[PDB]
Design a protein around this ligand. Structure first.
Ligand SMILES: *[C@@H]1O[C@H](CO)[C@@H](O[C@@H]2O[C@H](CO)[C@@H](O)[C@H](O)[C@H]2NC(C)=O)[C@H](O)[C@H]1NC(C)=O
Ligand SMILES: CC(C)CCC[C@@H](C)[C@H]1CC[C@H]2[C@@H]3CC=C4C[C@@H](O)CC[C@]4(C)[C@H]3CC[C@]12C
Ligand SMILES: *[C@@H]1O[C@H](CO)[C@@H](O)[C@H](O)[C@H]1NC(C)=O
Ligand SMILES: [K+]
Ligand SMILES: [K+]
Ligand SMILES: [Mg+2]
Ligand SMILES: [Tl+]
Lengths: 268, 39, 992
């Protein structure tokens, strides 16, 4: 033929069949032992998610949400993702004492449901009403963005203490139980309005620590609705929403490390 | 610890780099020694 | 074009002096007119040689920039700029990826260009050396007056004059001469002075006395002649053009390189476009379809391989430089290993090029002297009183002297003023009797008759050094038979005795044997003149026989020859044991050529020519079956009337071939004949008459000390110490480097698979990219470099000089067996070890292997800063990318770790590491430096930006260890099978 005879062509096939078969069987074996060394409830390493990311619902083309108020299908793209998220926080999804629980309607302290063990059933998560998100189809004019803190197993988000000076200096400082979120731009051509649990501009600490998908399915993380009823129009406004805390840090590279990058433009 | 389990989300990449560079250097020296056993 | 120049020349030495003048419109006495000479100048053109048109270095460099790998790397470099252009227009990408990768790849092509350019070097100044043989000026007779003119202004027809010490300015017809002798070594390779006279003495113009040639010099006397040829039209000017004009051609090693380039280029374009369409079918945007292709290019092309080859060659050439063997062309480092036939000059190559005493006949006994340079033999006789009598004649009846200031150099190597035979005798006595000058001071010469054409003897009368005599001793030497007709007694073991027919017959026997050995034989005799008949003041007349020259005492015979170099016989046998055919090709006479052939082992004992059979059986040569003769001796005059097909039959039908009295073109023809049969041929030589053959040879080797400038220009290799044993070393080195290149190539190729497979699974699996493009270049250009080179220092696995020369048609540098092992077996194991570490990194950070399938879409989505892992955690864009790049880093390090084992297995093709050992210090160096480089690239701060290399955790380093070990075991088991059964299965499938 090309290389060899039929007899040789066969033997080279019988070899590579057994050979690659063995190699596949060995590869799988090493994957088995790897998995055997891992927990079902907690990942081996967590230093790469460490400082929590802050992500929002409006799917930004490039950290930007520009549209026209005087146009219907101009914002119907951002309403798709906005709906996708909030559709999960339905009351019909949170039914019965299992696996949900009614928690303080005001920001409270942490809740420990034991260890990362299966020695108990599904760890009961705090309910969250999308109805706590006042004012927010969504904002056809002047968007109503929804913030979110990235989930990390066993992470206890710790707010800053009012020992020294603060950006939003001491205003509504629920020091003991709220992780604040203050959006900014100089360039003050807007109108910041925050909505959340208990009416505070933060995340209620009663939703922590997260026990993971395996030990807490259907779990709901707290949301923080932000509305920009800015009196300006037809210009790119670089708005940055920042979260503050002891376990919260940022990076010049990762522009989502505990903060937002939104470029709103109501070009109408 | 409990709420004070910050060490869980931390890794000493600084020491690791110091050690890694020490090792790389020493392996580089060892190599020179064996090569220079005759030039 | 040069087929005309490969033919024997035609001449006009047969014409009379007068007749020759009519042909050139010339005067025998007055010479040409100033006007007629200038007319002929413009007519024929200058008496000069024009160098052939060369290829500029520009075109030579750029021709390498387009050879398979460079072509693919160019397509990659441009395709980078393509994707970059498409980006800069569509979505403003502030990155530098495609732009920088395009710059890097273009640089890789340029630098790789320098390496191949360095390897494909051609240092040739043939025509320049020939031009150096034309004198600046010549002496001509114009308008009846002699004047010096620019030799280029010399034309056919003018009257030229030459004298001892000057170069022949052009081909001349001798019309007048006085004691003129010439050095025709340019045409023959033999430096013994040849007389020139107006008389025609041979039909063959290269043998007649009435022609003098350009490229030769007058050694003594004076001559006048008419110019018959000028410039390019001279006999050796044509040889110049032939030699300088010959097409170089591709070396065996070069052909091998191009061959695997085709193979690897083939699989590259195959998988390249095979997966380019396979991606579009899967619905991949052309934006991405090209990015994957660039990666495929980089994965398939072994970027550092061609440069490795060059370095391995260079390092092999450095070792040979250290044995006095200079390599002018890097590729010639290997040709000697692939050589199946050596065509060797005799004089100054196989031989020392110096008349040396070989045997002596005295006391009715043949004695043998030591002919070797360094005198590696033993003594023959010292005791016999006869010896001292013969020794005295050899010293006394000798007019040769050592040049001043030689006392530093060895006797046999020092320059001597005199003819070759007298120098030989001088050096013979000086060696075994001490200072000859002393013997010539103790015995003052009073009268002598120098060797005469008519007398055929030379005699001398000396004052006997003996005090009790202080009388007159007569000594003489000459033609053995002439000396015999002048002898009455023979000095036997001390005492004289009558010359009976018995001893006279033993003389003839001794004389015939020595002459049969191709040796020049001389007779020696002396006579103690009677005291009473010769007073202490008796005057001797040299002009008229004033003393007896008959009834003298015969002392002995001495024989001499230009002997082989000490190492030559043994080197010839060694070449022949390695299955190399050795042919002699010489301008010298057949009797001498044949005798040295037997001396060095070109013709082995018992082997006969058709002429030998005929003489032994006493029958006509036509009655001899030529197939009964394995040896042959072909004279150039017969070679001339043979067609190439008939020359091919001679080459095919004889194992032991001697081509004697060959011209320079004839040497070229014999070389081409050998090549025509498909053989790789080496030429060894030292003269300008070897230049065409040396050029045409696959490899020409010139002698460094004895070699002429031309020969060393025409060669690929120079033996700087004239050590012929270096050929044996050269062939051995050549074979070793050929095997080691295979090892180094397999090693380099093996790591291609773990660079290809990640890109494929990236498409078919939709997982995060396991390894990057930059990461690949860190391997092929970084870590693999020193290890791959180090394989050039591997010792032989068996006695390579015991095997036959490779068949260049069947035995390739890269075959299917190499690809099967490198690509199908070992590289495949490396790929898995890479993937394993990849799955380990991701799974330990929260992305278990199961959830990875079909996630790249969301993984690469720059706007999704919340991807969910297996544990329910959310990752930003840059966070998961850090893990991904950490995966690139550990996959990279996995390659290094699996290359550890590969380096050790590529060490040997057959033998076990437990047999060959670990005595390669460069290889061990490679292991340490490779690992140092990898660690540095991972842990050095800032490398995460320039190369996207991230620090690895200690446990990460050990992921591929079990795969590294399986490689070592697998290959060790496999080679154990090879050795345990030379049959073929494992052998014919995987044996590189
Ligand atoms: C989650 O809540 C949303 C609230 O808008 C539900 O949307 C309803 O969709 C139905 C049918 O398309 C409409 O008739 C209603 O007007 C919507 N709102 C309400 C309050 O009922 C959505 O269907 C819910 N999703 C799930 C899975 O239950
Ligand atoms: C990533 C995976 C799926 C690709 C696997 C490719 C396999 C099938 C390839 C890789 C190397 C290949 C072999 C390389 C060498 C030879 C020897 C030659 O004389 C005949 C073909 C043969 C035997 C090839 C057959 C196919 C082969 C085994
Ligand atoms: C939000 O909606 C409420 C009614 O639910 C209305 O009273 C109020 O004006 C709205 N706020 C703004 C800022 O438009
Ligand atoms: K050559
Ligand atoms: K490679
Ligand atoms: Mg010679
Ligand atoms: Tl490569």
């Amino acid at each position: 033929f090309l290389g060899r005879t039929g007899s040789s062509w066969f033997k080279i096939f019988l070899f590579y069949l057994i050979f690659y078969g063995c190699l596949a069987g060995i590869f799988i074996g090493t994957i088995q032992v790897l998995l055997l060394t891992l927990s079902d409830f907690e990942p081996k390493y967590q230093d790469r998610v460490a400082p929590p990311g802050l992500s929002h619902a409006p799917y930004a083309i490039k950290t930007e949400i520009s549209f026209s108020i005087s146009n219907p299908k101009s914002y119907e793209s951002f309403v798709k993702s906005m709906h996708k998220l909030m559709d999960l926080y339905n009351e019909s999804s949170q039914a019965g004492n299992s696996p949900f629980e009614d928690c303080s309607d005001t920001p409270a302290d942490y809740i420990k449901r034991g260890d990362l063990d299966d020695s108990q059933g599904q760890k009961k998560a705090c309910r969250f009403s999308r109805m706590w998100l006042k004012n927010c189809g969504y904002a056809e004019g002047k968007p109503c963005v929804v913030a979110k803190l990235n989930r990390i197993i066993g992470f206890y988000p710790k707010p800053l203490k009012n020992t020294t000076d603060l950006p939003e200096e001491l205003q509504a400082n629920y020091n003991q139980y709220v992780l604040p979120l203050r959006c900014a731009a100089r360039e003050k051509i807007g109108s910041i309005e925050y909505f959340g649990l208990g009416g505070y501009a933060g995340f209620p600490l009663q939703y922590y620590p997260y026990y993971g998908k395996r030990l807490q399915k259907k779990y709901l993380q707290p949301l923080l609705a932000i509305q920009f009823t800015n009196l300006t129009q037809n210009m790119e406004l670089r708005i940055e929403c920042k979260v503050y805390g002891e376990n919260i840090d940022y990076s010049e590279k990762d522009r989502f490390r505990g903060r937002f990058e939104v470029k709103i433009e109501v070009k109408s | 610890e409990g709420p004070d389990n910050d060490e869980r989300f931390t890794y000493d990449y600084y020491r690791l780099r110091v050690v890694g560079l020490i090792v790389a250097a020493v392996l580089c020296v060892i190599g020179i020694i064996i090569l220079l056993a005759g030039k | 074009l040069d087929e005309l120049k490969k033919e024997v020349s035609m001449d006009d030495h047969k014409l009379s002096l007068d007749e020759l003048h009519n042909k050139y419109g010339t005067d025998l006495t007055r010479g040409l007119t100033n006007a007629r000479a200038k007319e002929i100048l413009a007519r024929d053109g200058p008496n000069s040689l024009t160098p052939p048109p060369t290829t500029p270095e520009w075109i030579k460099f750029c021709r390498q920039l387009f050879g398979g790998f460079s072509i693919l790397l160019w397509i990659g470099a441009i395709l980078c700029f393509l994707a970059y252009g498409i980006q800069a227009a569509t979505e403003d990408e502030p990155a530098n990826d495609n732009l920088y990768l395009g710059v890097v790849l273009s640089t890789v092509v340029i630098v790789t260009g320098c390496f191949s350019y360095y390897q494909e070097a051609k240092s040739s100044r043939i025509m320049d050396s020939f031009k150096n043989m034309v004198p600046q000026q010549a002496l001509v007779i114009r308008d009846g007056e002699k004047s010096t003119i620019n030799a280029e202004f010399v034309v056919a027809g003018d009257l030229v004059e030459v004298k001892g010490g000057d170069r022949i300015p052009a081909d001349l017809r001798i019309i007048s001469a006085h004691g003129c002798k010439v050095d025709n070594s340019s045409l023959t390779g033999e430096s013994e002075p040849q007389t020139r006279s107006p008389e025609f003495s041979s039909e063959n113009p290269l043998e007649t006395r009435n022609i003098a040639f350009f490229s030769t010099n007058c050694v003594e006397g004076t001559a006048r002649g008419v110019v018959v040829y000028t410039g390019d039209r001279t006999v050796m000017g044509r040889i110049a053009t032939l030699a300088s004009g010959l097409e170089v051609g591709r070396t065996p090693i070069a052909i091998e390189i191009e061959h695997f380039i085709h193979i690897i280029t083939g699989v590259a374009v195959f998988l390249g476009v095979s997966f380019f369409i396979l991606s579009l079918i899967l619905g991949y945007s052309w934006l991405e379809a090209v990015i994957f292709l660039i990666g495929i290019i980089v994965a398939n092309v072994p970027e550092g391989l061609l440069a490795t080859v060059t370095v391995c060659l260079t390092l092999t050439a450095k070792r040979m430089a250290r044995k006095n063997c200079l390599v002018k062309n890097l590729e010639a480092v290997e040709t000697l290993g692939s050589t199946s036939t050596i065509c060797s000059d005799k004089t100054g190559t196989l031989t020392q090029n110096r008349m040396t005493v070989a045997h002596m006949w005295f006391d009715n006994q043949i004695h043998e002297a030591d002919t070797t340079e360094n005198q590696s033999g033993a003594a023959f006789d010292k005791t016999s009183a006869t010896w001292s009598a013969l020794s005295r004649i050899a010293a006394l009846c000798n007019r040769a002297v050592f040049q001043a200031g030689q006392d530093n150099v060895p006797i046999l190597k020092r320059s001597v003023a005199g003819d070759a035979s007298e120098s030989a005798l001088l050096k013979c006595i000086e060696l075994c009797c001490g200072s000859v000058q002393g013997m010539r001071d103790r015995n003052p010469k009073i009268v002598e008759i120098p060797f005469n054409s008519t007398n055929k003897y030379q005699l001398s009368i000396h004052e006997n050094e003996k005090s009790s005599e202080s009388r007159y001793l007569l000594v003489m030497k000459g033609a053995p038979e002439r000396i015999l007709d002048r002898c009455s007694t023979i000095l036997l073991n001390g005492a004289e005795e009558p010359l009976k027919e018995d001893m006279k017959e033993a003389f003839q026997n001794a004389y015939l044997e020595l002459g049969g050995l191709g040796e020049r034989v001389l007779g020696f005799c002396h006579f103690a003149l009677p005291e009473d008949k010769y007073n202490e003041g008796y005057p001797f007349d040299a002009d008229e026989p004033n003393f007896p020259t008959t009834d003298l005492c015969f002392v002995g015979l001495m024989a001499m020859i230009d002997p082989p170099r000490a190492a030559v016989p043994d080197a010839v046998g060694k070449c022949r044991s390695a299955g190399i055919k050795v042919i002699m090709v010489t301008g010298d006479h057949p009797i001498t050529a044949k005798a040295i052939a037997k001396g060095v082992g070109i013709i082995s004992e018992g082997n006969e020519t058709i002429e030998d059979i005929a003489a032994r059986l006493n029958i006509p040569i036509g009655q001899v079956n030529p197939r009964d003769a394995k040896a042959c001796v072909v004279h150039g005059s017969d070679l001339k009337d043979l067609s190439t097909e008939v020359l091919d039959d001679i080459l095919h039908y004889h194992t032991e071939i001697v081509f004697a009295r060959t011209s320079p073109q004839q040497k070229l023809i014999i070389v081409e004949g050998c090549q025509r049969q498909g053989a790789i041929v080496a030429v060894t030589g030292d003269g300008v008459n070897d230049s065409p053959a040396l050029k045409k040879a696959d490899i020409g080797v010139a002698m460094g000390i004895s070699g002429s400038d031309v020969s060393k220009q025409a060669a690929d290799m120079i033996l700087l110490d004239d050590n012929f044993a270096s050929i044996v070393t050269g062939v051995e080195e050549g074979r070793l480097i050929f095997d080691n290149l295979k090892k180094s190539i397999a090693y380099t190729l093996t790591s291609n698979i773990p660079e290809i497979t990640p890109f494929l699974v990236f498409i078919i699996g939709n997982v995060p990219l396991p390894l990057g493009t930059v990461t690949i270049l860190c391997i092929d250009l970084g870590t693999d470099m020193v290890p791959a080179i180090s394989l050039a220092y591997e010792q032989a696995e068996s006695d390579i000089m015991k095997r036959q020369p490779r068949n260049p048609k069947t035995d390739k540098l890269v075959n299917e067996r190499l690809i099967s092992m490198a690509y199908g077996q070992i590289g495949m194991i490396q790929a898995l070890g890479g993937f394993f570490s990849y799955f380990v990194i991701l799974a330990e950070n929260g992305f278990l292997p199961m959830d990875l399938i079909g996630k790249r879409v969301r993984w690469d989505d720059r706007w999704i800063s919340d991807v969910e892992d297996s544990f329910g955690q959310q990752w930003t864009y840059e966070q998961r990318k850090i893990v991904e790049f950490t995966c690139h880093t550990s996959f990279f390090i996995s390659i290094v770790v699996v290359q550890w084992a590969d380096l050790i297995i590529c060490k040997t093709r057959r033998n076990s590491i437990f047999q060959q050992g670990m005595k390669n210090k460069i290889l061990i160096f490679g292991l340490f430096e490779e690992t140092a480089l990898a660690a540095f690239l991972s842990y050095c701060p800032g490398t995460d930006v320039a190369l996207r290399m991230y620090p690895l955790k200690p446990s990460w380093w050990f992921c591929a260890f079990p795969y590294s070990l399986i490689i070592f075991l697998y290959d060790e088991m496999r080679r154990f099978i090879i050795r345990r059964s030379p049959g073929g299965w494992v052998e014919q499938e995987t044996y590189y």
